[PDB]
Amino acid sequence: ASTDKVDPVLGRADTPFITRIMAELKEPLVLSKGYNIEEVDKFLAAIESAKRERAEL
């Protein structure tokens, strides 16, 4: 009964790796399909800026 009984499927409860990955998926601005918000904000601003420059040539 003193053996370290680790669930062979789910492992030790509160494993830092398992918990952190789960938390990362539930962050406020996580996007799907490989997009990241930071790259999407710059890309959308670049479209506007690029359009203005094309309208100034």
Partner: protein, 53 residues
């Protein structure tokens, strides 16, 4: 019969092989990245027809 069955890759051949394989993986990642941005651009062009307010 006297010919060796296998000749191991020279260290130089292994270097050029690694360059091509890294390039192949990098090019596919880049091409997929650019395809996604081109779809994000074509979605921006039509987001004026979508309702959020």
């Amino acid at each position: 019969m006297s010919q060796p069955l296998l000749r191991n890759r020279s260290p130089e051949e292994s270097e050029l092989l690694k360059l091509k394989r890294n390039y192949n993986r990098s090019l596919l990642n880049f091409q997929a990245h650019k395809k996604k941005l081109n779809e994000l651009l074509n979605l921006y062009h039509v987001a004026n027809e979508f309702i959020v307010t």
